Amino acid sequence: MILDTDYITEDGKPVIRIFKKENGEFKIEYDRTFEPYFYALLKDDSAIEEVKKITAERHGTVVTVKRVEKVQKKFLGRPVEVWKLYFTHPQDQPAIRDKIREHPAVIDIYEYDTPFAKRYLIDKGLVPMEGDEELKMLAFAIATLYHEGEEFAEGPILMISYADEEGARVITWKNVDLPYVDVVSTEREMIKRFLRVVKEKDPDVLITYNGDNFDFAYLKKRCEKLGINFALGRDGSEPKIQRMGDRFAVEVKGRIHFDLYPVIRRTINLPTYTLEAVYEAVFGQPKEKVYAEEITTAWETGENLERVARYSMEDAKVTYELGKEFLPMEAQLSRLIGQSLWDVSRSSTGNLVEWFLLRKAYERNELAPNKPDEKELARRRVKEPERGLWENIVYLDFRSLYPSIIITHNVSPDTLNREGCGEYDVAPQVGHRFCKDLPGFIPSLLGDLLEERQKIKKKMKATIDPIERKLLDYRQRLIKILANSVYGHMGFENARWYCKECAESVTAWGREYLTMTIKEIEEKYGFKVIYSDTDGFFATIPGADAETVKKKAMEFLKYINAKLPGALELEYEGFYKRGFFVTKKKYAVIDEEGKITTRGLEIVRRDWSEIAKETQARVLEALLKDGDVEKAVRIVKEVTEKLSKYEVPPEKLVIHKQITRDLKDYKATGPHVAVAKRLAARGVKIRPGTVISYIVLKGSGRIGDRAIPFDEFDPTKHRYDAEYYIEKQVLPAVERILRAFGYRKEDLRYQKT
């Protein structure tokens, strides 16, 4: 299995290394035969002799064109003749490329800035992370001595924790008497011991959380300070930093440094990306945070070091588990995109699409178009649903609408307005013509992807190993997203295969096929379409029973799919006993077993009191389970009355809100801050991350001066602000739903007093 590739320089020539793990053993294969190159299109072939003599200087040495070769490749759908320019070293290209381009005889150059080791994987047809090999992983974390107003890593590393399948352990240089703690004399011995642990376990993957920007940088400075050869690379190298645009990344040669931070940042939306928040999100269970001042205070006083050690062990432990959780998906991605997990784990959707497409282009001998220049980048810059309760609803939607359009109409930059074609398809509204005589670059590669996905689904059934099936499932699911990412690519201003006409033709066709499908089902099968969005719609036959609606649905799908051209296909996605539709993106349905599914409506954040969430839930089931609007309305009115009668348990009024800044550097951004400041004033430790839990009390002033921490609420003396909970919690939770039935907030309570 291929893990990574790079190059070293040997007598001024590149030596590709391919890092592999085969039959449970690490191996480095060398290849000295591969040569840097890019392409030039010239006005007069004759000028090649001048172009061959162009030179530049890198460092203090002369850079020349090593050799040239006339080649034939596809550009804009047609065979073209271009000159392949070879160079001695990859770093020659940035030095000489602009001098070649600037030559008068040179029209343009192409494929001139692909990183050498990534070209290698492409041009040789190699794919990372392919095979049955099992990777050995090791997570690690550190805890440091922090003092505000100090330079970075001025203080020592206090603890290094690490976790793999054999458990988690902590290394530290003060005595902590715990079974999972290994005590050593000094920081230096700690670090050295950690090196021995890594070298002896020899993992293929090192997992961190934010190691790209903190852990390895800290370790680096401390190792400089202490004169330690931090030789974690399997070739004896030290971790190497790469500039990752705004910040940095770190490689450990011969291994994969999997930093979870960027992976998780893109996979899940959260307000905060602390390790504790991410571990609760993913695994559903809190993780306790020990703050930096407590760590430093513990080290200084010698007291509560066991608490520090446990936090350190847990950092490593949860980092490992998160790695176990996210890495297999990123590995399948890496295999499908054909680039290393190191690169893929840190790459935008954009970058990943381009790498896939560059490979396809190499595989089809198509000359890649160029990223736009800044002048070009500048150039590249409805229907409310039916109201009310519906019953016996079917959801029907297209299979891979945008890909399927692209395939069907052969939509591609290289097919657009092709001259002298005998057959073209014409985009609605926008009018762009796409030639059908020859399959386009994008349509052909998308057809292959959609096919492989169906082939993968076929094998998933023919398999029992649930693991193998999950890995097949990941690949299948990744292909679908890649297919849609290809569609987005055509509309993206920085894309190589940009094609604005392609993008706007695809969406135009989509609207035509959706709207036509809706027209047929209503006119020719008596359905009423309740709600539609882009690539699907809900409908019913008003007054029909569930079986009629299903049967007619299946008959319509047959009719429409026969009429639909090519790959366009509508499918039965589900049946729903009842539902309602507030607006685009906001709706609620219940299936025949009782399972409610909602979208755009449910009240989630912990900024909502339980009474709000509970009431909204009860409304939704009165609407969906009972089809009873008046009952939903009675529930609300009854809740708001109970509030006013001080009958709602105080535990259902509690609002929780996290402190984000120093209570000094705040925004007067709510009652949670006022409570925080009073606590601070009494001498309570408030930090970013402190959760404040409060109840709002009746009286005058902003809620702020009136709210109090839940643990101080005593019903025998305190009266909560029934009005606040009615008007600012309960009613806002239900108003959007019940507006869809003609009710305004004031219609859902008794009159104020």
Please say which residue, 340 or 412, places its beta carbon nearer to Mg ion: 340
| Cβ at position 117, least distance to Mg ion in Å | 12
| Cβ at position 417, least distance to Na ion in Å | 17
Q: Among 537, 514, 541, which residue's Cα sits nearest to residue 527?
A: 541
Q: Is 412 in the site for Mg ion (CB under 5 A)?
A: no
Q: In sequence order, which ranges of 625-664 are alpha helices (DSSP H)?
A: 629-644
Binds Mg ion (CB under 5 A): choice among 37, 87, 173, 355: 355
Contact set for Mg ion, span 146-205 (CB under 5 A): 199, 202
Strand partners, 144: 157
Binds Mg ion (CB under 5 A): choice among 1, 54, 63, 336: 336
Strand partners, 574: 395
Q: Among 453, 207, 438, which residue's Cα sits nearest to residue 323?
A: 207
Please say which residue, 77 or 403, places its beta carbon nearer to Mg ion: 403
For residue 173, what are its two tokens? 């240089």
Please say which residue, 12 or 422, places its beta carbon nearer to Na ion: 422
Residues 273-312: x/- map of binding to Mg ion (CB under 5 A)? ----------------------------------------
Query: 242: alpha, beta or left, given left = phi > 0 and alpha = psi -120 to 50?
Result: beta
Please say which residue, 25 or 423, places its beta carbon nearer to Na ion: 423
Integer Cα distance of 454 and 567 in angstroms? 13
| Cβ at position 335, least distance to Na ion in Å | 11
Integer Cα distance of 620 and 431 in angstroms? 45
Residues 384-403: x/- map of binding to Mg ion (CB under 5 A)? -------------x-x----
Binds Mg ion (CB under 5 A): choice among 253, 453, 613, 706: 253
Strands 528-532, 536-540: pairing kind: antiparallel
| Cβ at position 401, least distance to Mg ion in Å | 8
- Pick from Na ion, Mg ion, none: which does 213 bind, CB < 5 to 8 A by kind? Mg ion
| Cβ at position 55, least distance to Na ion in Å | 34
* CB distance 446 to 483 below 8 Å: yes
Query: 284: alpha, beta or left, given left = phi > 0 and alpha = psi -120 to 50?
Result: left
| Cβ at position 581, least distance to Mg ion in Å | 19
- Pick from Na ion, Mg ion, none: which does 345 bind, CB < 5 to 8 A by kind? Mg ion
- Pick from Na ion, Mg ion, none: which does 422 bind, CB < 5 to 8 A by kind? Na ion
Q: Among 434, 386, 387, 384, which residue's Cα sits nearest to residue 410?
A: 434
* Cα-based angle 386, 390, 391 (whole degrees, multiple of 5): 155
- Pick from Na ion, Mg ion, none: which does 202 bind, CB < 5 to 8 A by kind? Mg ion
| Cβ at position 550, least distance to Mg ion in Å | 18
Q: Report the run of H or E that residue 30 belongs to, with start and end.
A: strand 25-31
| Amino acid (one-letter) located at 217 | A
- Pick from Mg ion, Na ion, none: which does 425 bind, CB < 5 to 8 A by kind? none
Cα distances (Å, whole numbers) of residue 751 to 375, 481, 641, 739, 745: 63, 52, 10, 19, 11
In sequence order, which residues have a C-beta less than 8 Å from that of residue 596 and are 6 or more positions away? Answer: 588, 589, 590, 620, 621, 624, 625
| Cβ at position 298, least distance to Mg ion in Å | 16
> Which phi and psi (to 5°) does residue 199 adopt?
-60, -40
Q: Among 581, 511, 552, which residue's Cα sits nearest to residue 737?
A: 581
Please say which residue, 422 or 543, places its beta carbon nearer to Na ion: 422
Residues 638-677: x/- map of binding to Mg ion (CB under 5 A)? -x--------------------------------------
Q: Is 125 in the site for Na ion (CB under 5 A)?
A: yes
Q: Is 60 in the site for Na ion (CB under 5 A)?
A: no
| Cβ at position 140, least distance to Mg ion in Å | 8
| Cβ at position 19, least distance to Na ion in Å | 19
Binds Mg ion (CB under 5 A): choice among 93, 296, 319, 332: 332
| Cβ at position 427, least distance to Na ion in Å | 19
| Cβ at position 200, least distance to Mg ion in Å | 7
Q: Is 237 in the site for Mg ion (CB under 5 A)?
A: yes
Query: 615: alpha, beta or left, given left = phi > 0 and alpha = psi -120 to 50?
Result: alpha
- Pick from Na ion, Mg ion, none: which does 542 bind, CB < 5 to 8 A by kind? none
Residues 345-384: x/- map of binding to Na ion (CB under 5 A)? --------------x-------------------------
In sequence order, which residues have a C-beta less than 8 Å from that of residue 479 and are 6 or more positions away? Answer: 336, 449, 450, 452, 453, 456
- How long is the chain? 753
Binds Mg ion (CB under 5 A): choice among 345, 410, 412, 507: 345
| Amino acid (one-letter) located at 127 | V
| Cβ at position 436, least distance to Na ion in Å | 9
Q: Which residue's CB comes closest to Na ion?
A: 422
Q: Is 259 in the site for Mg ion (CB under 5 A)?
A: yes
| Amino acid (one-letter) located at 458 | K
Contact set for Na ion, span 396-455 (CB under 5 A): 422-423
HEC states along 451-499?
A: HHHHHHHHHHHCCCCHHHHHHHHHHHHHHHHHHHHHHHHHHCCCCCCCC
Please say which residue, 125 or 715, places its beta carbon nearer to Na ion: 125
Integer Cα distance of 354 and 505 in angstroms? 21
Size of the site for Mg ion (CB under 5 A): 27
Residues that bind Na ion (CB under 5 A): 125, 359, 422-423
Residues that bind Mg ion (CB under 5 A): 141-142, 199, 202, 213-217, 237, 253, 258-259, 332, 335-336, 338-339, 345, 355, 359, 397, 399, 475, 614-615, 639
